């Protein structure tokens, strides 16, 4: 009611009019008045402990591993020319499930571009691996370099 | 002839062929049930002694289990804010009288 | 379900009560019972299944004590100071039937049904009545012992 345009003046006299007393044309009960306890911009992020986040990711990856949903590959495609057709065929040989998380190193632009356009495929780097994307995927496909990079940064 | 039959803490005047709704009994439909009697009237003569009434029983066949009317309760007292809504449907059994 | 009267079910009869030497209140209570139909096993409070009652010799009704001079029937006309009173003695001389009538009406329910029941009461000062065509049954006021 303080941010709405106008509303500074007391509309009419306190007594004698026969109407309910009002302090502002922008009081909440007025049409066009201020909002009470309405939304205000707020940050929703939480300060989840590091150990909880890591353990959750390990749990998710272990669930895939036990169900044999983790695959390893040298490259998604051969050469330096992106080709979605090659990657789609190759991924079809690996998994027939709809959603697939592909974990590739930063440098493998041609692999990333080659899979990017496929509908259920999500691409991530191994340093960005997170519980939500693992649990959302039916299968996790690792580049050998990315899998080794993940194992090294953790198990060392 | 007709009899006054006891069932479910209540009494019903019934003759052969009468259909009566009574309190729920544990029997399947098609089962026959045997019920005690408070009075028998065979035309002119009235059977009323407890000794002779113990001799006699009415036979009825369970037709179906059914639900009575939906009762809606809305308890209320003014100037209190006290409201208590409640519903009820009594379980009933329908009997067809076969003999006396 | 409990028996309920239907369209054709109610059968009237005609009774005649000789009020001679009968106590007013006793006569009136008995007549009210018959008019209401309390003596019939088919009685239903929302139905008038009463019988017709003829009272004869309503001038020979008996009243005890000094009520003949000290009991007053009161009427108010609705105008200020419009309250008039008559003793039962004076009312018996001028309007013999009114005494018995008022007694019985005051023992009937004060509702619409009661007004319909009042239709069936006929009261006459003399020993005679015009209703021989209905062949009224003489009714004596008895008491069932217990």
């Amino acid at each position: 009611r303080g941010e709405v345009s106008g509303g500074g003046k007391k509309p009419y006299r306190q007594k004698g009019t026969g109407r309910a007393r009002q302090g502002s044309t922008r009081a909440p009960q007025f049409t066009g008045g201020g909002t009470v306890h309405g939304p205000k911009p707020r940050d929703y992020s939480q300060r989840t402990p590091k150990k909880m986040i890591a353990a959750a990711l390990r749990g998710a990856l272990s669930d895939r591993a036990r169900n044999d949903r983790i695959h390893a590959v040298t490259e998604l495609v051969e050469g330096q020319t992106p080709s979605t057709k090659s990657a789609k065929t190759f991924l079809g040989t690996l998994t027939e499930n709809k959603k697939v998380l592909v974990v590739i190193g930063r440098t493998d632009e041609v692999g990333a571009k080659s899979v990017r356009n496929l509908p259920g495929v999500h691409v991530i780097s191994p340093d960005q691996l997170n519980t939500y994307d693992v649990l959302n995927a039916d299968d996790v496909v690792f580049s050998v370099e990315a899998l080794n990079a993940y194992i090294s940064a953790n198990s060392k | 002839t007709y009899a006054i039959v006891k069932t479910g803490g209540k009494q019903y005047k019934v003759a052969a062929g009468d259909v009566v709704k009574v309190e729920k009994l544990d029997s399947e439909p098609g089962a026959s049930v045997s019920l005690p009697v408070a009075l028998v009237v065979d035309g002119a003569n009235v059977t009323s002694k407890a000794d002779d009434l113990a001799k006699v029983a009415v036979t009825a066949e369970v037709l179906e289990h059914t639900k009575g009317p939906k009762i809606r309760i809305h308890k209320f007292k003014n100037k209190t804010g006290y409201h208590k809504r409640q519903g009820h449907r009594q379980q009933l059994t329908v009997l067809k009288v076969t003999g006396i | 379900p409990t028996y309920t009267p239907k369209a054709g079910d109610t059968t009237r009869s005609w009774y005649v009560i000789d009020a001679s030497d009968v106590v007013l209140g006793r006569l009136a209570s008995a007549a009210a019972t018959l008019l209401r139909g309390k003596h019939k096993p088919t009685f239903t409070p929302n139905v008038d299944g009463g019988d017709f009652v003829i009272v004869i010799n309503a001038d020979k009704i008996a009243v005890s004590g000094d009520k003949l001079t000290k009991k007053f029937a009161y009427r108010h006309s609705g105008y200020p100071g419009g309250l008039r009173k008559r003793t039962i003695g004076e009312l018996l001389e001028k309007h013999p039937t009114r005494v018995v009538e008022n007694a019985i009406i005051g023992m009937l329910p004060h509702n619409k049904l009661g007004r319909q029941i009042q239709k069936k009461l006929k009261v006459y000062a003399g020993p005679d009545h015009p209703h021989a065509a209905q062949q009224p049954i003489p009714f004596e006021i008895k008491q069932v012992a217990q």
Binding site: - | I4, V41 | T44, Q146
Partner: protein
């Protein structure tokens, strides 16, 4: 997430107004007035379901009394005599006999009167 109230709000209104069909004036037409009457209506209904049992018993007793007195016995002595004879017919059916089978009722009156003490007004 701004929520408009109409969808949820209208449901209870339709229920109350359906229940108030047949009421007169504002009580059939306006939700607020029909709601008020519904409070009374369901209170009355609850109360009268309880009272109904007494009201029917009152009717049966009156009918039994008329039939008893037509057989030269008062109601109170009839009930006493039926108890002494051990006849367990309740008043609902006693009234149905009084209406639908006067002969059977008369036979019950004879049973009751026989089982009465010789001197009803004697000690014990």
């Amino acid at each position: 997430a701004r929520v408009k109230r109409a969808l949820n709000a209208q449901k209870k209104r339709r229920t109350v107004l359906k229940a108030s069909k047949g009421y007169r004036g504002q009580r059939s037409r306006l939700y607020r007035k029909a709601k008020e009457q519904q409070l009374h209506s369901l209170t009355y209904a609850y109360r009268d379901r309880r009272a109904r049992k007494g009201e029917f018993r009152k009717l049966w007793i009156s009918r039994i009394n008329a039939a008893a007195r037509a057989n030269d016995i008062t109601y109170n002595r009839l009930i006493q005599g039926l108890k002494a004879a051990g006849v367990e017919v309740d008043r609902k059916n006693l009234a149905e006999l009084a209406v639908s089978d006067p002969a059977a009722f008369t036979a019950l009156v004879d049973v009751a009167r026989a089982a009465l003490p010789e001197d009803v007004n004697a000690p014990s």
